[PDB]
Amino acid sequence: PQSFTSIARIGDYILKSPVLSKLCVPVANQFINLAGYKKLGLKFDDLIAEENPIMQTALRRLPEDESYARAYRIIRAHQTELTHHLLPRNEWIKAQEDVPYLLPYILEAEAAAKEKDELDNIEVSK
Amino acid sequence: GPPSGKTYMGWWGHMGGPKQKGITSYAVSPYAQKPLQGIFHNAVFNSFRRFKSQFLYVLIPAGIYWYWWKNGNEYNEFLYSKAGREELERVNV
Amino acid sequence: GPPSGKTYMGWWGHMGGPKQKGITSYAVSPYAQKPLQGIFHNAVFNSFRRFKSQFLYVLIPAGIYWYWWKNGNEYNEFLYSKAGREELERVNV
Amino acid sequence: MTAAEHGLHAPAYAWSHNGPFETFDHASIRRGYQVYREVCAACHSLDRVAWRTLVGVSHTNEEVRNMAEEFEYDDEPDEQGNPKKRPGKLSDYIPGPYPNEQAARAANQGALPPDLSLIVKARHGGCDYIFSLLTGYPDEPPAGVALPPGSNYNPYFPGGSIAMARVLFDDMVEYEDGTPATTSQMAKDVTTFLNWCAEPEHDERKRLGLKTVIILSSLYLLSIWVKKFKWAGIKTRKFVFNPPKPRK
Amino acid sequence: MAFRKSNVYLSLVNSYIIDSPQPSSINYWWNMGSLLGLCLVIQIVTGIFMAMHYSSNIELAFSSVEHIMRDVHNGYILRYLHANGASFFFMVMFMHMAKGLYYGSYRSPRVTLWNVGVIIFILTIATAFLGYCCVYGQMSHWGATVITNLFSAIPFVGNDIVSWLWGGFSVSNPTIQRFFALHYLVPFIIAAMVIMHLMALHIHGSSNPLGITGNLDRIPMHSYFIFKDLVTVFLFMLILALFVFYSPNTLGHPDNYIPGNPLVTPASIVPEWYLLPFYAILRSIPDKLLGVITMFAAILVLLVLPFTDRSVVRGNTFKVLSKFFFFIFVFNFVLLGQIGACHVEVPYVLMGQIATFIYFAYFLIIVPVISTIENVLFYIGRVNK
Amino acid sequence: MAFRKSNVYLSLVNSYIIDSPQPSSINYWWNMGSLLGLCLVIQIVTGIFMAMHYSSNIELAFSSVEHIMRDVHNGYILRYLHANGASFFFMVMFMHMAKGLYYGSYRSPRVTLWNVGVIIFILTIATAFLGYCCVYGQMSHWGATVITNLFSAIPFVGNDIVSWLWGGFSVSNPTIQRFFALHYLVPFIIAAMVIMHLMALHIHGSSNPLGITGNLDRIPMHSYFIFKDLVTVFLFMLILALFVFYSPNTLGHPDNYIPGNPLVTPASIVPEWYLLPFYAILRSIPDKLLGVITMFAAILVLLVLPFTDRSVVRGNTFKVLSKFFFFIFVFNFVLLGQIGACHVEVPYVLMGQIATFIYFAYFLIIVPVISTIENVLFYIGRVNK
Amino acid sequence: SFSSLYKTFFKRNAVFVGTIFAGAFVFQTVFDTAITSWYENHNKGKLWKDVKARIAA
Ligand code: HEM
Ligand code: HEM
Numbered sequence A: 001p002q003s004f005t006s007i008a009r010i011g012d013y014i015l016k017s018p019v020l021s022k023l024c025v026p027v028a029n030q031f032i033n034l035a036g037y038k039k040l041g042l043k044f045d046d047l048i049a050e051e052n053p054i055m056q057t058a059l060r061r062l063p064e065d066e067s068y069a070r071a072y073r074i075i076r077a078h079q080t081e082l083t084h085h086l087l088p089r090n091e092w093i094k095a096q097e098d099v100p101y102l103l104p105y106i107l108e109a110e111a112a113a114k115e116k117d118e119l120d121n122i123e124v125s126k
Numbered sequence B, C: 001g002p003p004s005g006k007t008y009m010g011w012w013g014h015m016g017g018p019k020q021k022g023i024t025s026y027a028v029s030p031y032a033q034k035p036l037q038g039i040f041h042n043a044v045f046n047s048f049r050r051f052k053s054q055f056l057y058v059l060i061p062a063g064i065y066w067y068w069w070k071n072g073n074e075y076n077e078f079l080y081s082k083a084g085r086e087e088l089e090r091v092n093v
Numbered sequence D: 001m002t003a004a005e006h007g008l009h010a011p012a013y014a015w016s017h018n019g020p021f022e023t024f025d026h027a028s029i030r031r032g033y034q035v036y037r038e039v040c041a042a043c044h045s046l047d048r049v050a051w052r053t054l055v056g057v058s059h060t061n062e063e064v065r066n067m068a069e070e071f072e073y074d075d076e077p078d079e080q081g082n083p084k085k086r087p088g089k090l091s092d093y094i095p096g097p098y099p100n101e102q103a104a105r106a107a108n109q110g111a112l113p114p115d116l117s118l119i120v121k122a123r124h125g126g127c128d129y130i131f132s133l134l135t136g137y138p139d140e141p142p143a144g145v146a147l148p149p150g151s152n153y154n155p156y157f158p159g160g161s162i163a164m165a166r167v168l169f170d171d172m173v174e175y176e177d178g179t180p181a182t183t184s185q186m187a188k189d190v191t192t193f194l195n196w197c198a199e200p201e202h203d204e205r206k207r208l209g210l211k212t213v214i215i216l217s218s219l220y221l222l223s224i225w226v227k228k229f230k231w232a233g234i235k236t237r238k239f240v241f242n243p244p245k246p247r248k
Numbered sequence E, F: 001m002a003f004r005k006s007n008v009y010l011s012l013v014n015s016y017i018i019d020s021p022q023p024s025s026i027n028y029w030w031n032m033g034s035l036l037g038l039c040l041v042i043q044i045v046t047g048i049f050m051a052m053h054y055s056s057n058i059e060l061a062f063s064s065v066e067h068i069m070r071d072v073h074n075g076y077i078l079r080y081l082h083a084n085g086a087s088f089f090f091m092v093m094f095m096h097m098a099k100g101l102y103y104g105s106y107r108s109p110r111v112t113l114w115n116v117g118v119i120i121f122i123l124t125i126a127t128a129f130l131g132y133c134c135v136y137g138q139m140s141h142w143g144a145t146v147i148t149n150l151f152s153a154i155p156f157v158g159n160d161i162v163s164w165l166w167g168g169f170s171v172s173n174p175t176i177q178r179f180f181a182l183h184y185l186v187p188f189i190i191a192a193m194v195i196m197h198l199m200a201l202h203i204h205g206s207s208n209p210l211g212i213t214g215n216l217d218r219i220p221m222h223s224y225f226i227f228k229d230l231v232t233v234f235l236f237m238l239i240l241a242l243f244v245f246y247s248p249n250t251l252g253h254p255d256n257y258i259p260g261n262p263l264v265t266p267a268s269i270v271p272e273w274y275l276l277p278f279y280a281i282l283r284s285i286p287d288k289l290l291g292v293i294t295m296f297a298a299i300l301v302l303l304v305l306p307f308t309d310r311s312v313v314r315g316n317t318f319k320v321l322s323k324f325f326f327f328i329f330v331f332n333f334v335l336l337g338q339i340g341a342c343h344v345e346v347p348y349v350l351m352g353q354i355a356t357f358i359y360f361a362y363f364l365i366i367v368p369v370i371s372t373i374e375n376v377l378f379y380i381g382r383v384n385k
Numbered sequence G: 001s002f003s004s005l006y007k008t009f010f011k012r013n014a015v016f017v018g019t020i021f022a023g024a025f026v027f028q029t030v031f032d033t034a035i036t037s038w039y040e041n042h043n044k045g046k047l048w049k050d051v052k053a054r055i056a057a
């Protein structure tokens, strides 16, 4: 368990710096290519686990179409892994279409959860 | 029974997973299917491609530790071979 | 959860007993009253009333079987008492 | 972990009883016992095997008795309580020649003589190791090595010092025919005998194992087939997605 | 309503065996665990049938085992089956734990399952040691003495507690009687813990190998998975038969077949194959208190593995660096066992100490830093601006 | 939501000890059942600490009992508590039975419960005999001989099965070894059966003493009935102390304290007090096969009690004749036991035969006809025309 | 000739179990005797059967 606030902060810091970006973008691309999940038919906006209640709030905020598409992709992945095959090289998830559709619905709720956990322990102030 | 806590999985009819629509699963029934539709092509080709795709992940650690173990062994028997007064005493003692 | 068979007693709230209206209960809390009320008067009086009510149900069977046991013991004693040559033989067979 | 303290690693001899489908060569147990009784004599124990299990495995029915009436076993007393000795019967163990323990340490000039009844099942390697000990003695003691008096050298014993000498010479058993005067022969007989006495269940065990492995192999293949069969109702289902109508 | 869900005695078996929505993508390791449980039950059964013909003294304990192995109709099968079934039980136990580590089962949903499991682990190690003491061979007696003297490290109460548990100044009749009675009792407690493990499991089901939510589709146990457990247990039964008949003494050492003798000790004192990793670290750090505490530390670290990994993505199928480190970890474990089995000499001490350091470090520090690297790489690679 | 009802390991205990709506009008007999449960658990615990210091060979079984008697610090308490707690357990179980039969808990909605219970009954009788053999005094050897030979009444092949169960052609090492191992095994099976007993009980609560619906009002389990159990268990502890310290050798018979001698037997050989009732009916009818079948037939005629009690009004709290007949039956039972204890001579064979006749008659025919008369009288009394 | 006659022969569950048990019986017997024969003749001069004959004179 590790919040996406820290991840977003680290990511923005890395991306803003130009030289460090030139150093780390190619290795990131090659890593996500060798990750072994684009081919079998997964977007990275699904691999994140679904035990934390914040994840439940995130999913409950999704629109209908994306939830249905996510269900189709996950069940198809289940079946294809069961078969031991991989999908044909026609529906491999192309790199340019790995859009983040779920990250904002994590951060929007993570901020509220963090400020809830903070505001309880307020002081009398002056 | 007394009410129990919230759970992310239930029983049949109330799985609780996201509601899906448009999925249309099919079947063929096991009797009229000729089980071993692919038994040699699937076997050899899938086995070799899967062995290729996950080959390094065991070659690298096993090779590293085999090299380590071989070096340790060779130094050990070099210790107890006409070297117990000059090499043994400089590390052991 | 997996649904189970029909049951004649539910849990709190859905207990299953007949619904009733107009029944009123009370209580006075343990700390506001003497724990030992009656202690002796109820002891002696209720004890004697209860023992009087059910005396015969335990008196009669005990008496019957005591009578059997006494008769059996006395006959057994008479059997093996200067009677093993004139009574024991004619009844042992 | 020097070589001297550990002894030569056991070789890979080509046994006769080894192999997944091989029994004993117990046409030689019949003489392995003979040589063992001649040469071990009053030194090692073998006090765990009962004369009712050398019948039908190495000796037919009556010879076991015909030597069993040559020992004593100290059975129950007479009417006066004096303990009585009677000839041995068919369900009594071999007597360890040294009475309790002390005569052993008084006669070996050293340590206890280890129990042979389970020795070759209780040493590292072991099937060859006893053979190596029995034949590994150099004909001349090694040069430039300290050795305590009495004990004889061994290139196979861990530590290189054995308390027993090498009484395995030639022309000293003479089983029934032309065969002895080859110390390898006596060594082979005794090692086969001890490998049997460690477990008088080799033949039956191998047979039962063969039966079980055949049955299990057949059952395993059948299970493979049935798993391929009734799992095939889901290992081939196909899903077809349809974009649901966007209305809410 | 169907009778399968009406009678309570059968409603329970329905909910756990006849119908339980296992996930679709299950690989052979869940069947590996079920095979493990069935190995436990066959071990218990043959243990009872063993104990019906076993004495319990100390001058008449070795004689009992030689009697059961040589002079009883169809007996040696029982004794070799108990021993090699225990060894295979430890093999499958380690395999089950390794699967748990690899696929992300130890994560948040089943921390209670993980705790109950590690409790079962320490119980099982205790049981195996107890039974291995029950034989009272040559090295088994030394092992019993060493472990019963381990507790002397505790300050103040260092000689009273050993004098209590040991029941005497030396290993004698009370020691072995106590050990045998405990060895009989504690497997039933293991069975109770197994029941608890099942209850804590069924509350949330099993996990997908992909590390994804399994609340989408499921298929029942019976008529689909019962056959898979059947095939894997057929494989286990045949390999166990191969061991118990063809080559019996390969998963052990030829020293238990020696009468107990508190006069001399073997050239090398080694535990059975399934304890060498938890024996190398004892020779590793040369402080008695440090070793006694670091064993239970090596278990407590498995306890503390939850809320240590902090990758938002469960499992290690999709993290190349994490799974590569897992493989170097498993080879670390086997190397640790091997380095323990070999003697303590000049290179071996450095080998073992470095092994312990990298092992505990992988549990403590490697996993979090690698996890954070993985998460940040995933976050930055797929985003552009 | 309250943590007591959320965690599974505690949500289980909540519904059985912390929140279980027992009926308002409870008396001390269900508290007595709780007493029985605690007697079982203390029996198990003291049995473990007993077998911790008990040998198993036939030659060293009696010596083991004297050793647990004196040569172990604070050990005679263990042995006496084991024995007298067993006897008190059997008495309290008999009283649990008689309660159940009187109040009509065996009415249809609890037949599974009642069957499971009588299974515990037969199992417990077997356990008691097994342990009494485990002692191997003087008359326990003859008791084992006879009860093993009991099965020889089986038609055709009867000698092979008894020789198999009896470990050979003589009472020897395998006999007592197997008997002790099975005795040490069975009470855990009893524990499994009684957890099933609790499971079957929880489906429909516990019966009122009035034999009427209790779903109207109920009061919570804890803080009310836990103390009703505490008072009775304290009574049990004090009476057991009175029997274990001041009056040890009363409930049992002073014959076990003899070395086994299969050459001489005393003319007065009787079972312990809680097996006399069945022994009487066994020695009553003049046949071997008839007696062997009629013991288990006594158990089965216990079984047949449901769907025979054809009173529309549950229980025997409002039937003068039925309760009078129940009292004649319980005094019948005690008379049967005592006549079994006494020797068989001329005035006793007829006595015992009549006793068995009235016993089985009460089970079969007394309950239905008397019940029907009660029901018809109840109808006729309160009707005009 | 796998016509409907075998399907009717397999229709009744009880006769299916009877046939499987009878097959188990005959299989046990013939398989055991065959395995013993193969194990025996595979070792000429080893097993006691012929050794006692040879020592007979
Ligand atoms: C007696 C020993 C054990 C038994 C009988 C047992 C039983 C089971 C069973 C039946 C399952 C479900 C699938 C399977 O069979 O694997 C399971 C799963 C599991 N067990 Fe155990 N187990 C035992 C020991 C352990 C131990 C020691 C641990 C951990 C230290 C453990 C942790 C787990 C985990 C993590 C799962 C995860 C399933 C999932 O993620 O899909 N178990 N166990
Ligand atoms: C609960 C019933 C059990 C009984 C009655 C039992 C009894 C025995 C007995 C008699 C021995 C051999 C005693 C000796 O050699 O002197 C033994 C050995 C052993 N038992 Fe158990 N056992 C039981 C359960 C278990 C369990 C559950 C395990 C582990 C999962 C286990 C592991 C072992 C091991 C490893 C040995 C090895 C020592 C040897 O080979 O004998 N036992 N057991």
Ligand code: HEM
Pocket (backbone or CB within 6 Å): F029, F030, F031, F032, F033, F034, F036, F037, F040, F096, F097, F100, F105, F106, F113, F114, F116, F117, F118, F119, F120, F121, F194, F197, F201, F205, F206, F207, F208
């Ligand atoms: C170790 C053995 C047993 C245990 C631990 C046990 C435990 C219990 C418990 C806890 C109850 C709830 C009320 C009470 O405590 O009495 C109960 C009730 C009952 N038990 Fe048992 N029992 C045992 C043996 C038996 C046997 C052998 C039978 C009958 C053959 C039996 C028949 C009953 C019946 C009929 C109830 C009815 C309660 C009601 O109707 O109000 N029990 N038992």
Ligand code: HEM
Pocket (backbone or CB within 6 Å): F040, F043, F044, F046, F047, F048, F049, F050, F051, F054, F064, F065, F068, F079, F082, F083, F086, F087, F089, F127, F128, F131, F132, F134, F135, F183, F184, F187, F256
């Ligand atoms: C409720 C269940 C049990 C009952 C009713 C029971 C009853 C008895 C009885 C009557 C004896 C005869 C002892 C005497 O003559 O003084 C006995 C002996 C014994 N029981 Fe049990 N027992 C039970 C459970 C157990 C358990 C669970 C164990 C062990 C864990 C155990 C261990 C023993 C031992 C070791 C003896 C030795 C004989 C003696 O020293 O006199 N028992 N038991």
Ligand SMILES: COc1c(O)c(C)c(C/C=C(\C)CC/C=C(\C)CC/C=C(\C)CC/C=C(/C)CC/C=C(\C)CCC=C(C)C)c(O)c1OC
Pocket (backbone or CB within 6 Å): E125, E126, E127, E129, E142, E143, E144, E146, E147, E182, E186, E189, E269, E270, E271, E272, E275, E278, E279, E282
């Ligand atoms: C000398 O060379 C060595 C060596 O160096 C090592 C390390 C080992 C390895 C040995 C170990 C690692 C020892 C580990 C063994 C244990 C930790 C077992 C210790 C014993 C126990 C823990 C007894 C447990 C018994 C019980 C009855 C537990 C109590 C039960 C409770 C509290 C539950 C109560 C039940 C309920 C329902 C509340 C050897 O075996 C060995 O010999 C070769």
